[PDB]
Design a protein around this ligand. Sequence first.
Ligand code: B12
Ligand code: B12
Lengths: 542, 542, 532
Amino acid sequence: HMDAITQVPVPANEPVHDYAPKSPERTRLRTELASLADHPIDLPHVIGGRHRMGDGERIDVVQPHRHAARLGTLTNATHADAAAAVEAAMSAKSDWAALPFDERAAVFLRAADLLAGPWREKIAAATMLGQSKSVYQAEIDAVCELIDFWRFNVAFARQILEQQPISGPGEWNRIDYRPLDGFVYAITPFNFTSIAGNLPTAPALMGNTVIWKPSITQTLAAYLTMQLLEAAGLPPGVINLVTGDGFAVSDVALADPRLAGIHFTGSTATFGHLWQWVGTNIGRYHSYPRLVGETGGKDFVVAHASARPDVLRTALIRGAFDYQGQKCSAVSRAFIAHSVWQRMGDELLAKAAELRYGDITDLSNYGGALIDQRAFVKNVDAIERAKGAAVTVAVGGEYDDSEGYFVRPTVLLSDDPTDESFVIEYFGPLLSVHVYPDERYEQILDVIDTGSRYALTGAVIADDRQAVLTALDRLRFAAGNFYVNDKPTGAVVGRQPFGGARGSDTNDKAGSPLNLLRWTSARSIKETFVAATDHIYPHMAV
Amino acid sequence: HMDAITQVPVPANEPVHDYAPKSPERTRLRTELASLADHPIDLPHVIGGRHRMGDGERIDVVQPHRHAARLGTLTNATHADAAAAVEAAMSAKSDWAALPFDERAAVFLRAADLLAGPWREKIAAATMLGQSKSVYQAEIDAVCELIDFWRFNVAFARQILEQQPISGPGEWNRIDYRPLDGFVYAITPFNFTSIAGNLPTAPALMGNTVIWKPSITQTLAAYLTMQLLEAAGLPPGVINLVTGDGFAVSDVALADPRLAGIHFTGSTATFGHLWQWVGTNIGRYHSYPRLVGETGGKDFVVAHASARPDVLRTALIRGAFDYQGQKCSAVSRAFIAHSVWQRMGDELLAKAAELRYGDITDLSNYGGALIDQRAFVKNVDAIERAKGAAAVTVAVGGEYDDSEGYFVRPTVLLSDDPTDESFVIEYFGPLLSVHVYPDERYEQILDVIDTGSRYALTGAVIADDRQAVLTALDRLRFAAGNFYVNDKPTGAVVGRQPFGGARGSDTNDKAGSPLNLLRWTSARSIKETFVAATDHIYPHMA
Amino acid sequence: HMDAITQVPVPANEPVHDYAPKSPERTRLRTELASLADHPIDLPHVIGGRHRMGDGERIDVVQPHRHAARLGTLTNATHADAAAAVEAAMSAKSDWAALPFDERAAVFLRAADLLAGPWREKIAAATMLGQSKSVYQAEIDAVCELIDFWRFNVAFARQILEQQPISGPGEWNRIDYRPLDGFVYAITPFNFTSIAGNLPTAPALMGNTVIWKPSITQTLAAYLTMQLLEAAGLPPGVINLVTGDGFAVSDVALADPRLAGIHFTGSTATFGHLWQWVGTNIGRYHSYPRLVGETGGKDFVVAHASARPDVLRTALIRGAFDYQGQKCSAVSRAFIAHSVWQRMGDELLAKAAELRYGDITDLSNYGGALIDQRAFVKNVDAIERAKGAAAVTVAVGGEYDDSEGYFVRPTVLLSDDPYFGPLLSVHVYPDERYEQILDVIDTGYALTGAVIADDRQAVLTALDRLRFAAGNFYVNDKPTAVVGRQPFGGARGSDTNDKAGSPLNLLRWTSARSIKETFVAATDHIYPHMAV
Ligand code: B12
Ligand code: B12
């Protein structure tokens, strides 16, 4: 037993290492990079703690920047693999939920520290190699964001458990934050190792068990993440990894009456599909399935006449070309005041032309390649469509998939304000610029407001305080998270929570205590010390 | 302007008046009861501030305990009325949302004080008359719970606004809790004037506008609630009352692309139907519609051998027979240890037979009648079902008479085997089933309760023995939402028993906590960077 | 537009850079020192965002440690310039006060960060060159203290807004912290770039507009401060810089009915002048003008027999000779126990003689020159007065030479019996007369005082006996103040707890109102006591 009201360790954001030349983290990275690239492995399912290949189709995981070089080979999950995954989760449930919160929280605090230290460059390298991230992109994702999710989630949960009601006289009221009944189905995207690791672990923390199907092109980092958690003491069957395209996993998971929730990322259409499925089939499930996730998007930047040219240029290059434009959202559209374009337009184009995409084991590259052949084709189609469209290819537009899925940084010049519908059909290094007359700032904000339904983030570049405030007012609803004098980009944990595209309902996604509450079912407990012994009410008296 | 970080008044639960003989509030109540009953009124739509009867069929609102006596007449809303209400809500949106939080809050704080003072016995009487509540039931509902919702939600909202993120060095992060785009559709049940009043006002507080369709039999109190809110300063069009059965209202609201959310009560099947509809048609809406509500249920009480018999008796009588069993849930099943039944069985049956249901203007009555003809018929069916059933005996009560009011007597069913839950949910009325179990089979009975209950909102254990209490807390942890120790299991007091819900439900975002107000917001982060990067190159590239 | 209750960032004191050899801030500093010295500029007024030279007489701004070298040239404000600055302030007021606190706050937060990074060495260099500060004196003033002023004032302001009343039942009470009606007049001294920058920006933060009149010798750093603020996003006309001696500026500003307050730091001589001038015109002002400021003073150090000699010796050197004794207060009198003087007197004199005053672009120098010819003269007069006095011996230093800079050597005087400059008077007293020496100090004005003693009774005796003899008291350190750490003070009898360094200052730039809403007020006027 134990008699205490304990605290969890206070979290702070994990520092970002630079990997400068001659740094010790740089040397350790090269060691891990070589270790992973020279020794490809089976990428097995992990079900009830046991690691095995299944009988499904073998699919190679390759380096996107060098797709002749294989990192590993997984087996596409069969229905039977999926069924085993679900039985393993259900079977582990009782012992996992019976652990005190602190013991469950220690698993992820230990995992965070393992990732911060001895596992650091290995998870980063795995992410670099499988997902074609530069070391910086891997460091902010696979290391810092995942570590932050774990430590801040533990703190979030402890804060939740402490939210308690008022006790009136003669009584005692308490709230018990129960885990869910049944298993959680986590489906994770290629874009981030952090999301990949967090969607399955966040409900686990609250006492739930999980089947996890990661994206194929992220599976090397996913599998190592699974190993890391095991090394941290995660009991077998608490999270169950099944690899592949997810088709057979979804057949099984959505047919199981014990399905408690789905933690995922996807489009509005995907949400709608799952909504329609769960609603149509609600009578099949023991619990009402909880559908929790986020969408992707494409972002905008608007520069006022008072914009600092160099800050804008840099915000644009990073916002559009960090990770080859393959974050959950990237900057696709820039709205630049004429006088500002006169001052930094040529520089933007020149820097874009010089920007290096290549093998990310060459640390001098800015970035790598697109994630797979499918993503490559969509970028080529968008580029060709731009060439023929009455818009100019000011720089870039070159592509070559002979060795890696490489697409050059591309700037399009649109005479008229760029139509949003066109930029959402691909994810890649494609920036559209519209130059507008300085004096039409308010008109352009209205065009941005009127024509943006798919932005996660937006930014205004301006030193003028009125212009900043006007943008904050006028574009209040045109994007979720909004930025002043910086690139609009991914959130740091605990610093830019919430957001979402216009009209969305995703404030319960990862990044705040609201996400963890979805994986709980609160009940109130009331005890009355001296309750009534006569049912008569005062008003009934003669 | 204004330069301040303001606090809202600190909320405390509103005191409950007793209306004992010779009390001033009892005299005021009698004045109000006569005024409403002797002067039936039109019950019009309130659209954009204009009170109008429409062209739909006229429907009488009556006293359920004396259905020959009209209280008013409403008109069934047409599609045109519903369209006008939506347009009024969208017209009022801009000025309302632009009001500072404090001024929007003031409206509902003022309404709280109006209901606590000058409007108190009028709203109570309206609820008494229309919903057939005793004054005690009116008081805890129409007065105290509605007041507590307003004052506590204002405090909840202010607490939400204060939830802010970390600022790293060189930056400033802030969170903006935006209203939704579009209107909220509020659909409210007959059972509580408080719920009827809270579901449309809670979103309004956060800067939204609303169409409100109340239940026909609650429409006298709902219309007066609407008048109260106007007297407190609610601007026109912010809440728009449309009367009737809701069919045409739902046609229009669910077809309008500006539908932002629905705030309602209903069954799992209703939730499923709305999920199915919104998912199938997601492409029609500007925003992802938010479906926020709660369900009803039927509750249980288990008495251990160490239960205090007078306490158990009182909790069963009040739990099953308060408001004729017509709360959101009520006690339908009691599981009582043999030796405790020997001590209080005869007294339970005798008290139940003596319990007076009648005209609630006669304050000496315990309670009134069922809410309408349809509910009466369902009770009759349940009683005849029991009479013909081999398993069960009518031990007391079972009489019914709809000739003057919709009256059904307090009824106790004795069941040889544990009562099958599926029977007790087909009605809402004063029907208590009792199962007597051998003292020594306490844990077995707990397993039976657990295995056979899917629809309990609340549950209670009566027991002085601490092991027995703790065993119930553990073993029935998931068999009900809110759980009670040595008291009747019933409706929560605001801020004292939040959350709950039936097994597997997902309704922790319902009214009663800050989580509900967050659903009527769309939070965004704002990040200003003071000295952003001016070169895009990264340290690892050197 | 926002629905939120926001927090401002948490302020921490800015780290002081050491500028040691081979350090990168040293290289960056040398670049800025050359760039400012080799390319003197016009120093214009800044009125409604417009940078304009005026028609008043041209006045050069030079390096005090090399007064032949011009740093820039300003024009002395004319009545017309002053009137233009006032109109620009009043015209800018409406859009500035209408900005939300957070947006006004961002300007100074952004300025703070700009000063910490890209502007750091330039502003420090301008302060070194114009005011003759060593790089250390520049860094703790022009950089760290100004940065701290901005970040902590933002935190202080936000904590003021949060100070709210209690609501009884049936009501809602709130407090609105309004800005002032009218413009605030900031007049700032040569001593500190940080003070020069804080006096106009602090009222600005609370939503006021300002005319700012800096000291001629500080005007290079002040103008760059103005540019930095503009680069941070300060809207035009919110602060208006008028250069010169300020005679014309005061003529206009103190006659204008819209004068809301004066924010000043410098001599009590020139504050008497300006205190008085309001005293007469009082019926003319729309608002009761708020006079807020601080004056100078000179400090004592008393060393008990238990004083550590190395500590005392170091406290005296730095306290007396940091910035050539020209801080808002300097150590000018020391009272040293005989046994202690035997142990460190010779070393004090020796060190004082070796202390290098010179061109502060020579980073090996301890300090530079006095601020101007007027200051040079008053020290010479003081030195020559000491020579000619009986009870006074010039034990070391006393030399001076204004031929190239305004240089006065570190000087220690010895008096048998008990102006800004590097002059220290030492009185040696017998150990066993500690309490009598305390009485003497008490009876003999002083801003800060310090006791050097390891003995706790001795320490506590001084804290008790000199409680009212100084406004800031120090134990085992030089009395030479840091934002948020040693606030308040003032000379004996002064009323200046509302000066810079605490929330009380920002409150002087606000007029608070209460707002009360009653939800269900009385509908009858008769009282219960009136019934029959
Ligand atoms: C809805 C859906 C789609 C949608 C997806 C988005 C939407 N809602 O508008 C659209 C409508 C895009 C779609 C397209 C197709 N899909 Co489909 N899709 C489904 C379904 C029913 C649900 C998937 C889902 O939402 N999962 C939940 C989310 C959270 O998980 P997810 O891993 O992120 O799911 C993504 C992928 O599954 C992907 N996807 C969907 N279908 C297909 C098909 C292929 C070949 C690939 C590579 C990817 C892919 O889209 C989802 C959203 O990103 C499944 C059934 C199933 N068993 O999976 C099929 C299913 C996967 N798709 C199938 C087929 C046949 C098709 C189509 C060829 C025909 C068609 N038009 O429906 C095309 C191929 C498109 C392509 N990408 O190459 C088959 C796959 C058969 C197989 N290869 O083994 C499935 C299994 C249904 C079936 N049994 O017939 N369909
Ligand atoms: C889903 C639904 C039902 C369900 C409800 C529960 C469920 N999901 O399993 C069941 C399946 C119970 C149902 C039954 C019937 N309903 Co129906 N119902 C609907 C529907 C499509 C949506 C209602 C809803 O969920 N509203 C949202 C909730 C949150 O709001 P609510 O006010 O609380 O809704 C409640 C009432 O509408 C009530 N209800 C539903 N139908 C009917 C019909 C009548 C006559 C009454 C009095 C009440 C009622 O059930 C809801 C939940 O309690 C509507 C269409 C519409 N425009 O409203 C019809 C609709 C109201 N019902 C209709 C009809 C014809 C019927 C039935 C007579 C025949 C049938 N089986 O379809 C029966 C009558 C039942 C009765 N109580 O008398 C017609 C009404 C025509 C008219 N008189 O003007 C509608 C307009 C359209 C339709 N048939 O599709 N239906």
